[PDB]
RNA sequence: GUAUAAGCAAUUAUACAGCGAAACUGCGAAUGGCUCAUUAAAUCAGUUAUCGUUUAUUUGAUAGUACCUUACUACAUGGAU
RNA sequence: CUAUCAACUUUCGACGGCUGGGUAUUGGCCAGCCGUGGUGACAACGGGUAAGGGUUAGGGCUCGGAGAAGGAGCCUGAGAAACGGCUACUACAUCCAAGGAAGGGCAGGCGCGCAAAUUACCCAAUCCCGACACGGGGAGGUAGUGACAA
C-alpha cells in the first residue's frame, strides 16, 4: 500500500509497481533463484488473482455488490470474483478481446458484452447462451431495463434508407433487432465500403438512467449529443456541438444534469433545459478522457474524471475546485466505484488491476473492513 | 562492475535533486541487465525525453553509467552483436553536445595531451607511456565508433581526437 | 448477395434469446411530469 | 487496397522481374514474361509450384474472376448393363491472365497446393478449339 | 469454439452435411492478438512440437529498413496510419502485418549525416527523393510492417520508398 | 489461544498455555508479520518484542499471509503457496484458510521472538539447539570457517561419531562428501572435454584439406576431358 | 505387438514362436524392410532359445552390428549390416534371395570390413559443406564430388570414410529391393525418365527375363565385380 | 545425478568409497480394454503430393568465435528448499 | 435403392480474387473490400437404413463414430480438446462434535415361491513399458464343470 498525494490522500492498496514490469517468467526465475528482501507486511493483495498478465478492459460491481466481473486480454477472458470470499469464483475464456460488458440481473447470473469481433455474447453461470452478430461495429453497450432491450451504438453509415448513422437495439422478450435508432453522424465518402472509412463516422457513448425518467442519450464524433425518449422510439434533442469527440456521458443522482466530455480533455456539466453550460473544465493534456461518473460523499456531491494520460481527477460540482488528483502510473481503461463508498476499481493496461481508496470520500466497503485499519497503520507510519 | 555500479547509482540517488528525480525509474533499468537495450530506446525517442531545462543535471550521471555499461564484459555475447552493437547503440543515440563529456570520461590521461608543438615532434611525450597496451585498444575501438557515428559534427572536437589517434599510432610504429 | 454474416438485420425471433429478463419499471417519476419535460427543451 | 508486389524483389533502388519456369516441358508465354500484371496464385509470377497430377478438359464457364470450371467427361462401366455410360464432373482452376481465354477450348491444368476450397489447379496450356456449349460431348 | 475445420460448411455442390465429429487439437485455432501501441507486453505460447511462438499484444519499437542505403535501425512506433483490410484497426491502432505506420526518423537522420555528412530534412551519391525528404523534414517517416507481430513477437519492417511511398500517400488522400 | 512461541536465533520453541483473554487483547487486529510488544503479556516478558507468524483458528484452519478478511475465507491456492500442497502437478485447489487478522476465535498463535529482554524464559531462551547438518559445499565451508587458500577443507569438515551394533564396538565417523571440491578427476574431465574439442576441430581441418585437394584434382581431370 | 501373420513375409517365422511377433525398434532401416536382432539371433540363426537368453547375449558386449556394439534387443538391421560375433568368430551379412526373403551369409574380416551402401541424397549442409546420406542413414561429410544420387559407396566401417563408388549405369548389374519383382539379381540394361514422378528402369537377369522396376526399388551391386559375396 | 538415515556393515594411511529405506531429479499413463443415438464415396479402399506441415525416442554426422578502457582489478560461483 | 424427391446452395459464406488474423502449414478456416455465383435429368438435392479390402486351386488368414453425473471454460506433453485432473453452475450422495469436509466405474446374484458352466492358478513361454540384465503388465497360456451333441 502506498499514498500518492499530500492534502487529501488516496491509497494504492493493490497495483502494479513499475511502468515496465519484466516478463513473469523471468520474475519467477529471479525469485526462485536469487536472494530478495521484500516488504512482507505492507505489500499484499486483497482479492486472489486480481490480474490478467497482459492488460484489462472493464470492471463492474453488481447491484448486489457481491460479484466483481472483469474482462482482460491474454487468452481473452473474464474473471468473476466473489467478493465475500475474496477469491476467484471462476474465469471463463472467450473468442476475442472484450470491449464492454454489463450485468443484467442483480447477481452475476446474466451478463452481456459487446465483443471486438462484432459480436454480442450473453453469459449465464451454466455456460453461454448463443451469440448474436451485430451487423456493423460497436462502441458501447447500454440496457433499457423497463422495456428490456440492449442498445449498442455503431460506427459508420447505414447500408440503405437514410445515411444518418445507427444505434442497434434488440429486445430480450421480443428477441429480434427492433430497428436501428437513427442518429446523424455527418457526411462520408460515397466511395468506401460498408464499414466506413478511417477518418470519421462513429457514435461513441450511449447513456441512460435506471431510476429516473431515463432519456437515452447518445454521443457522436462531430461534437453532438442526442436525446431519445422511450415509448416514443423517435428523436427528442440534438445539441452540444464541440470540437472534440464526445467520450463521456453520465447522469447525476437527481435525474437532470449531464456530465459530458470531449476527446481533447474538456468536460461540460450541462442542464437538460439550459443550452449554456453549468460548468466547464479544460484540464490534463491532449490525450482523450475516458470515463466520468458522479459520486456522493454522504453529504456532498462530486465527480470523477479518468483520462488515458494516467490522470484521474475527482472534481467538485458545487464549486468546481479540483478536490483531488491521482496518477495511476500506467494507462487505465476503465473506472468503477464500489457503490457503498471509498474504493475505485480501475482496469488498466498493466498486469495487475489496480484499486484506490479514499478515506475522505467514504469508508471501507462491507467486505474488506480492515482497509480502514491499514490506512490507520500507514498514518502511524507517517 | 555491475554491483558496484548499482551501489554507486543508489548513492547518486541518495543525493536528492529534482533534476534526477523524474528519471530514477529510467536510470535503474539500465543497470537491470535484462532491459538495457529496451530502456535505451525508452530514454531516447520516448514520450519521456530528457527535458533541456535539467539536461545539465542528469547528463554527467547518465553518461558515466552508459560508459560503464559500454565497458562491462560480462553479459555481452561474442562477435560484433556482443558489445559492438551495444557501443554503437549508445553512441548512435547520444547527442553531439553530450559526446564531449562522453569522450571526456573516455580519455582519462589522454584528455590533456599535446602531440605537436611549435617544433615538430614531442619526443619527451612519446618516450613515455600513460596507458597500458591493453587499455589503448578499447579506446581506439570506442573512438572509431564515435567518429563513424558522428560524421561531420567532429568539427568542434578536432583538437583532441587527432592527438589521441596519433599518439597510439606512433607508439605502435615505435613498437614495431 | 453482399449481405450474409450479420451485415443485413435479419429480423428473426431468436429461440433461446426469447424469455431472458422480465421488464422491471424502475422510474421514480409519475409519468405526468415527464412528457411535459420533453416538450420544454431548447426549442420551446 | 494495398500495392501488389512480387514478394522479395527490390524495385526502389537508385544505382527486375522474377519469373520461374514451371518446367514439365512447358514454355512461358510472353505476357507471363513481361506483362505487368501481378498475381500471387500465378505459377509464373507467384510462388505456386505445380506437382503431381496433370489434367486436361473443356471449360464450362469462363466468366468468373480468374477461375474456370472444366466439365470432364468419361465412360463408366456399368456391369448391370455391361455398358459404357457418360459421366461428367466439374473441376475448378485458377487462371493466369497470361493466356488468351476462350470458351469451349481444351485447356491443360496442373495440380498445386490448395488455393481455395475448390481451387487446386492452375492453367498451363490452352488449345484454341471451336467447341460449343453444353450440348457438345467428347471424352477428353 | 474457435476452430479450423471445414465440417460446418457446405460442400462444393452446394450441399450441407451432418459429418459430426468432435473438435480435435490439430484443428486448433487460438484467439487473435490485436497488437497495439504501448510498452512491451508479450506472452509466449507453446505449440506442437513444443515450439514457442511469441504473441505480442502491446509493442513500442521495431527496427525498420532504409535498405536502399544499407541501414536498419530500431525506432519507435507513433500510430497506425492506414490498414488495407479493416478500418477498426486504424481506429483502435492495431499493429498487424502490411500495416502502414509512421515511425520516428532520428536514427536514420543520424546515420545519413554520419555516413554521407550532408544534413537532411532541416556530393551526388547522397540523394533523397523529395517526398521522402518531406517525411524527414516532418521527422516522422511512413514505414510498412513486414513481420507478423502476433506470431513472432516483434513489429519490424522496411520503410516505404518511391512508388509504394507515393501510392500510400495517395491512399491516405483517398 | 495457546501461544506456540519460537526463538529462531537460538533454535528453540515452546507452547505456552494462555488463559484470560484480557492479556491477549493487544494481539487483536494485528496482521501476520507485525511487531507486538510482549511487555503487556506477563512480568517475565519485560523487554521482549515479537512478530506474529501465523496461527490456526477453531476447527484447525491455517492462516495465510495476505488476506485482509478477519473471518474464514475460501481461497484458490496455486502450487508454491502456503497452506496447500499439490496432489499432482499443475493443480489449483480451492481451500478454506483463516485470514491474517488475529481475532478472538484462534486456537494457536505462532509467535517468533525477534528481540529479547533482560529476563530469560526458562525453557525457551535457555536451551541451545545446534543446526542439524553442517554445510556440504566447499565454499560454504570456506565462508563458515573463514579458511584461506591453503588450509585444505577436508580436515575442516564437520564430523559426527555414532556407535553401531555388534555389542558395543568402536565409535564411527561420518563426513558429508563435499560437492564443489576440485579433484584431479574433475580437472582431467575438463582436460578430456577440451581435448575432444581440439581433436574434433583438427579432424575437421584434415578432412577439409583433403576435400580441397581431391576437388581440385577432380576439376583438373574434368577440364582434361573438356 | 503384431501377430505372427501380420509380421512381414521376408523375415520368416514358423509355427513355433507363439501367435505374436516382436516389433522392430525405431532406427536406421525402415519398419517393413527390417530384420530385428532377436529374429536374427534366435529365430534365424538359433544361437539362443528364449527372450531372456537373447537378453543375456545382448547385454554383455558380445554382439556388434555394423562395427559398433548394439545393446537393445529389437535393434533394426535391415540390409547389408555386417554382424560380428567374436566368441564364435563369425561375421554375417544380410542379402536377399530370388524368392524375396532374408538370407544370411557367413564371412571373415576381409569382406566383413566394408559396407556397400546406396546413396539416398547429396546436399549442402551447415557450414557450406556437401554431405552425403545413404540408406543406412549414414551421413558422410566432404564426399567425392561425383557421387550423385543412386550411386553406391564402399564405406570403410572402421573410420566410416568413402573408399570406392559405383555409378548408376545402364550395363551395371543390380539387385531389386522392393516391388512385385522383389529380389532378382540382374543387369540394368535400360532406364526411362518419366519426369513428373516415378521413373522406371528396364532390367534383365543373366538368362533373359526383361522386367520394369522403379529406380527407388533398385539397388546397385556391381557391374560384374561382386564386391560382396553373393552365396554360391 | 543428489546419501551425515542419530540405517546396516568395516579397517590398515579418515572429504566420500560397500549395501542402501526416505526424499529431491529424469522417465511413464495419446492406451489395455468398457457403454451405445450412429456413421450412405464426407470417412474407407486403391492412387498421388507435401516445392504446404510438426515429430520425444532411434541411429549418423555434427559448434573457428579470442580481444574489445572494471586493472591503483578478478582467479577454489550463487542462493533456495 | 429410389423420381409419391426437380430444383438445390446464397438460411453459420454460396463461388472467387485482394489484404491480413489464427494454425505446425495451405485453405472462406476466420475478419474487412468488391465481383456474380456454384450444382443439377450424364442424375444434384432429398428420402429410405437393412453401415467391405488385401492375400487369388479352395477354404482359411489379415485389416477395418460418440462418452466417461450434464452442459461451459482451463492445465500437461513430441503426440489428447486425455476426461487424467481443476473452477463455477446444475443434479445425487457420505462423515460430523453441526462450525465444516471428501465423492461420482465395471463385474456378480435375484429378476416367480422352483434352481442347472469356476468368485481356479501363473507371467513359465510369445509380447510391452520403464534410470534399467533384476522392476512392473487383466494380452496370453494352464486347470476345473459338461448325456447338448460327437
TrEMBL record, chain B:
Signal peptide: none
Superkingdom, taxonomy of origin: Eukaryota
Protein name: Uncharacterized protein
Naturally occurring in which organism (per UniProt): Chaetomium thermophilum (strain DSM 1495 / CBS 144.50 / IMI 039719) (Thermochaetoides thermophila)
Region of the whole protein represented: 934 to 1109 of 2612
UniProtKB/TrEMBL annotation, chain C:
Domain of life: Eukaryota
Family: Belongs to the AATF family.
UniProt lineage: Eukaryota, Fungi, Dikarya, Ascomycota, Pezizomycotina
Protein's name in the database: Protein BFR2
Automatic annotation (TrEMBL), chain F:
Coiled-coil ranges from the UniProt annotation: 197-226
Matching Gene3D superfamilies: 1.20.5.2650
UniProtKB keywords: Coiled coil, Ribonucleoprotein, Ribosomal protein
Presence of the UniProt keyword Ribonucleoprotein in the record: yes
Example of a GO MF term: structural constituent of ribosome
SMART domains hit by this protein: Ribosomal_S6e
Biological process annotations from GO: translation
GO cellular component: ribonucleoprotein complex; ribosome
Entry similarity comment: Belongs to the eukaryotic ribosomal protein eS6 family.
Protein's name in the database: 40S ribosomal protein S6
Lineage of origin: Eukaryota, Fungi, Dikarya, Ascomycota, Pezizomycotina
TrEMBL record, chain G:
RNA-binding S4 domain location: 35-99
One example of a Gene Ontology biological process annotation: cytoplasmic translation
UniProt keyword annotation of tRNA processing present: no
InterPro entries: KOW, Rib_uL2_dom2, Ribosomal_eS4, Ribosomal_eS4_C, Ribosomal_eS4_central_region, Ribosomal_eS4_central_sf, Ribosomal_eS4_KOW, Ribosomal_eS4_N
Domain of life: Eukaryota
Keywords: Ribonucleoprotein, Ribosomal protein, RNA-binding, rRNA-binding
GO CC annotations on file: cytosolic small ribosomal subunit
Pfam families per UniProt: 40S_S4_C, KOW, Ribosomal_S4e, RS4NT
Record CDD domains: KOW_RPS4 (cd06087), S4 (cd00165)
Family: Belongs to the eukaryotic ribosomal protein eS4 family.
Protein name: 40S ribosomal protein S4
Biological source species: Chaetomium thermophilum (strain DSM 1495 / CBS 144.50 / IMI 039719)
Amino acid at each position: 500500500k502506498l499514498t500518492n498525494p499530500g492534502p487529501v490522500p488516496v491509497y494504492t492498496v493493490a497495483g502494479p509497481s513499475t511502468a515496465r514490469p519484466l516478463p513473469d517468467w523471468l520474475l519467477r526465475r529471479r525469485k526462485r533463484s536469487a536472494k530478495y528482501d521484500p516488504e512482507n507486511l505492507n505489500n499484499f493483495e486483497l482479492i486472489q488473482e486480481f490480474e490478467f498478465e497482459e492488460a484489462s478492459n472493464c470492471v463492474r460491481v453488481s447491484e448486489d455488490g457481491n460479484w466483481i466481473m472483469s474482462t482482460g486480454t491474454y487468452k481473452p477472458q473474464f474473471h468473476v470474483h466473489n467478493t465475500r470470499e475474496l477469491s476467484l469464483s471462476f474465469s471463463r475464456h472467450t473468442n476475442s478481446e472484450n470491449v464492454t460488458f454489463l450485468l443484467l440481473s442483480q447477481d452475476y447470473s446474466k451478463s452481456v458484452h459487446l465483443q471486438c469481433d462484432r459480436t454480442l455474447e450473453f453469459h449465464t453461470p451454466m455456460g453461454c447462451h448463443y451469440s448474436i452478430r451485430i451487423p456493423r461495429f460497436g462502441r458501447d453497450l447500454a440496457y433499457l431495463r423497463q422495456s428490456c432491450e440492449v442498445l449498442v451504438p455503431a460506427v459508420g453509415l447505414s447500408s440503405d434508407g437514410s445515411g444518418y448513422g445507427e444505434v442497434f437495439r434488440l429486445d430480450l422478450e421480443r428477441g429480434q433487432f427492433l430497428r436501428p435508432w437513427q442518429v446523424d453522424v455527418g457526411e462520408d465518402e460515397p466511395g468506401s465500403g460498408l464499414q466506413g472509412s478511417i477518418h470519421a463516422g462513429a457514435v461513441n457513448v450511449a447513456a441512460v438512467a435506471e431510476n429516473t425518467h431515463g432519456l437515452c442519450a447518445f454521443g457522436t464524433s462531430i461534437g453532438t449529443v442526442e436525446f431519445y425518449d422511450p415509448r416514443s422510439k423517435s428523436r427528442v434533442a440534438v445539441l452540444g456541438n464541440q470540437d472534440g469527440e464526445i467520450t463521456a456521458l453520465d447522469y447525476s443522482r437527481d435525474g437532470l444534469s449531464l456530465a459530458l466530455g470531449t476527446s481533447t480533455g474538456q468536460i461540460r456539466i450541462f442542464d437538460l433545459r439550459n443550452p449554456r453550460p453549468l460548468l466547464k473544465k479544460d484540464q490534463g493534456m491532449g490525450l482523450p478522457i475516458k470515463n466520468l461518473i458522479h459520486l456522493t460523499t454522504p453529504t456532498e456531491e462530486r465527480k470523477l474524471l479518468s483520462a488515458d494520460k494516467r490522470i484521474i481527477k475527482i472534481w467538485d460540482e458545487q464549486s468546481g475546485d479540483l478536490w483531488t488528483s491521482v496518477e495511476p502510473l500506467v494507462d487505465l481503461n476503465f473506472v468503477t466505484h464500489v457503490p457503498d463508498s471509498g474504493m475505485i476499481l480501475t482496469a488498466n493496461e498493466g498486469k495487475q488491476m489496480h484499486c484506490f481508496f479514499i478515506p475522505n470520500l467514504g469508508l471501507a466497503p462491507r467486505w474488506c473492513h480492515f482497509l480502514d485499519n491499514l490506512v490507520h497503520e500507514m498514518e502511524s507510519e507517517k | 562492475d555491475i554491483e558496484l555500479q548499482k551501489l554507486a547509482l543508489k548513492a547518486i540517488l541518495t543525493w536528492k535533486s529534482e533534476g534526477i528525480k523524474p528519471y530514477q525509474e529510467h536510470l535503474e533499468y539500465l543497470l537491470d541487465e535484462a532491459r538495457f537495450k529496451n530502456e535505451l530506446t525508452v530514454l531516447f525517442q520516448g514520450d519521456n525525453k530528457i527535458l533541456p531545462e535539467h539536461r545539465s543535471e542528469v547528463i554527467p550521471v547518465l553518461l558515466h553509467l552508459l560508459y560503464g555499461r559500454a565497458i562491462s564484459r560480462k553479459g555481452a555475447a561474442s562477435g560484433r552483436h556482443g558489445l559492438h552493437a551495444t557501443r554503437l547503440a549508445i553512441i548512435r543515440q547520444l547527442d553531439v553536445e553530450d559526446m564531449g563529456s562522453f569522450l571526456d570520461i573516455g580519455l582519462g590521461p589522454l584528455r590533456a595531451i599535446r602531440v605537436v608543438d611549435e617544433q615538430g615532434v614531442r619526443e619527451s611525450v612519446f618516450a613515455h607511456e600513460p596507458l597500458p597496451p591493453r587499455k589503448q585498444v578499447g579506446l581506439l575501438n570506442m573512438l572509431e565508433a564515435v567518429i563513424n557515428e558522428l560524421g561531420t559534427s567532429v568539427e568542434p572536437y578536432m583538437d583532441a581526437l587527432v592527438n589521441s589517434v596519433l599518439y597510439c599510432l606512433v607508439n605502435a610504429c615505435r613498437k614495431l | 448477395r453482399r449481405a450474409s454474416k450479420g451485415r443485413k438485420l435479419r429480423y428473426t425471433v431468436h429461440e433461446k434469446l426469447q424469455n431472458f429478463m422480465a421488464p422491471e419499471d424502475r422510474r421514480s417519476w409519475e409519468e405526468h411530469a415527464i412528457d411535459r419535460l420533453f416538450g420544454t427543451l431548447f426549442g420551446q | 487496397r494495398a500495392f501488389l508486389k512480387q514478394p522479395h524483389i527490390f524495385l526502389n533502388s537508385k544505382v527486375r522481374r522474377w519469373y520461374k519456369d514451371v518446367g514439365l516441358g512447358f514454355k512461358t508465354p510472353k505476357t507471363a514474361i513481361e506483362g505487368h500484371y501481378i498475381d500471387k496464385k500465378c505459377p509464373f509470377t507467384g510462388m505456386v509450384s505445380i506437382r503431381g497430377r496433370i489434367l486436361t478438359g473443356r471449360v464450362v464457364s469462363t466468366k468468373m474472376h480468374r477461375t474456370i470450371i472444366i466439365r470432364r467427361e468419361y465412360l463408366h462401366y456399368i456391369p448391370k448393363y455391361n455398358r459404357y455410360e457418360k459421366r461428367h464432373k466439374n473441376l475448378a482452376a485458377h487462371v493466369s491472365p497470361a493466356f488468351r481465354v476462350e470458351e469451349g477450348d481444351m485447356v491443360v491444368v496442373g495440380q498445386c497446393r490448395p488455393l481455395s476450397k475448390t481451387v487446386r489447379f492452375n492453367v498451363l496450356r490452352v488449345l484454341p478449339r471451336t467447341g460449343k456449349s453444353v450440348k457438345k460431348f467428347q471424352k477428353f | 469454439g474457435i476452430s479450423r475445420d471445414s465440417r460446418h460448411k457446405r460442400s462444393h455442390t452446394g450441399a450441407k452435411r451432418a459429418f459430426y465429429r468432435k473438435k480435435r487439437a490439430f484443428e486448433l485455432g487460438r484467439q487473435p492478438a490485436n497488437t497495439r501501441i504501448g510498452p512491451k507486453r508479450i506472452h509466449i505460447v507453446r505449440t506442437r512440437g513444443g515450439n514457442h511462438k511469441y504473441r505480442a499484444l502491446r509493442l513500442d519499437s521495431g527496427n525498420f529498413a532504409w535498405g536502399s542505403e544499407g541501414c536498419t535501425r530500431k525506432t519507435r512506433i507513433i500510430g497506425v496510419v492506414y490498414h488495407p483490410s479493416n478500418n477498426e484497426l486504424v481506429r483502435t491502432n492495431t499493429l498487424t502485418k502490411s500495416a502502414v505506420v509512421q515511425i520516428d526518423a532520428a536514427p536514420f537522420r543520424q546515420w545519413y549525416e554520419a555516413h554521407y555528412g550532408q544534413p537532411l530534412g532541416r556530393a551526388a551519391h547522397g540523394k533523397v527523393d523529395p517526398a521522402l525528404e518531406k517525411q524527414f523534414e516532418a521527422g516522422r517517416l511512413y514505414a510498412i510492417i513486414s513481420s507478423r507481430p502476433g506470431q513472432s513477437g516483434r513489429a519490424d519492417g522496411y520503410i516505404l520508398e518511391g512508388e509504394e511511398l507515393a501510392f500510400y500517400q495517395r491512399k491516405l488522400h483517398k | 489461544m495457546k501461544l506456540n512461541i519460537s526463538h529462531p536465533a537460538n533454535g528453540s520453541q515452546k507452547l505456552i498455555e494462555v488463559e484470560d483473554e484480557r492479556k491477549l487483547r493487544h494481539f487483536y487486529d494485528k496482521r501476520m508479520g507485525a511487531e507486538v510488544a510482549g511487555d503487556p503479556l506477563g512480568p517475565e516478558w519485560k523487554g521482549y518484542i515479537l512478530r506474529i507468524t501465523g496461527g490456526n483458528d477453531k476447527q484447525g484452519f491455517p492462516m495465510k499471509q495476505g488476506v485482509i478478511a478477519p473471518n474464514r475465507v475460501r481461497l484458490l491456492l496455486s502450487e508454491g503457496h502456503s497452506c496447500y500442497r499439490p496432489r499432482r502437478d499443475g493443480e489449483r485447489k480451492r481451500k478454506s484458510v483463516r485470514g491474517c487478522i488475529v481475532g478472538p476465535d484462534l486456537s494457536v498463535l505462532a509467535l517468533s521472538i525477534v528481540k529479547q529482554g533482560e529476563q530469560d524464559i526458562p525453557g525457551l531462551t535457555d536451551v541451545v539447539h545446534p543446526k542439524r547438518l553442517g554445510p556440504k559445499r566447499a565454499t560454504k565451508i570456506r565462508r563458515f570457517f573463514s579458511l584461506s587458500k591453503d588450509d585444505d577443507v577436508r580436515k575442516y569438515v564437520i564430523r559426527r561419531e555414532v556407535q553401531p551394533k555388534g555389542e558395543g564396538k568402536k565409535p564411527y565417523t561420518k563426513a558429508p562428501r563435499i560437492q564443489r571440491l576440485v579433484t584431479p578427476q574433475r580437472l582431467q574431465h575438463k582436460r578430456h572435454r577440451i581435448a575432444l574439442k581440439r581433436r574434433q576441430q583438427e579432424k575437421v581441418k584434415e578432412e577439409a584439406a583433403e576435400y580441397a585437394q581431391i576437388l581440385a584434382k577432380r576439376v583438373a581431370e574434368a577440364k582434361a576431358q573438356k | 505387438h503384431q501377430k505372427r501373420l501380420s509380421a512381414p513375409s521376408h523375415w520368416l517365422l514358423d509355427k513355433l514362436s507363439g501367435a505374436y511377433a516382436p516389433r522392430p525398434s525405431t532406427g536406421p532401416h525402415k519398419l517393413r524392410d527390417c530384420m530385428p536382432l532377436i529374429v536374427f539371433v534366435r529365430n534365424r540363426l538359433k544361437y539362443a532359445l528364449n527372450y531372456r537368453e537373447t537378453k543375456a547375449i545382448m547385454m554383455q558386449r558380445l554382439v556388434k552390428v555394423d562395427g559398433k556394439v548394439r545393446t537393445d534387443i529389437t535393434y533394426p538391421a535391415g540390409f547389408m549390416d555386417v554382424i560380428t560375433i567374436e566368441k564364435t568368430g563369425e561375421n554375417f551379412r544380410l542379402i536377399y534371395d530370388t524368392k524375396g526373403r532374408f538370407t544370411v551369409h557367413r564371412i571373415t574380416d576381409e569382406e566383413a570390413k566394408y559396407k556397400l551402401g546406396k546413396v539416398k541424397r547429396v546436399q549442402l549442409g551447415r557450414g557450406g559443406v556437401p554431405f552425403l546420406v545413404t540408406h543406412d542413414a549414414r551421413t558422410i561429410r566432404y564426399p567425392d564430388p561425383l557421387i550423385k544420387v543412386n550411386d553406391t559407396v564402399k564405406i570403410d566401417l572402421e573410420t566410416g570414410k568413402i573408399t570406392d563408388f559405383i555409378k548408376f549405369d545402364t550395363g551395371a548389374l543390380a539387385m531389386i529391393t522392393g516391388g512385385r519383382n522383389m529380389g532378382r539379381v540382374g543387369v540394368i540394361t535400360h532406364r526411362e525418365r518419366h519426369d513428373g514422378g516415378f521413373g522406371i528402369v528396364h532390367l534383365k537377369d543373366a538368362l533373359d527375363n526383361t522386367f520394369a522396376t522403379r529406380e527407388s526399388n533398385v539397388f546397385v551391386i556391381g557391374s560384374e565385380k561382386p564386391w560382396i559375396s553373393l552365396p554360391k
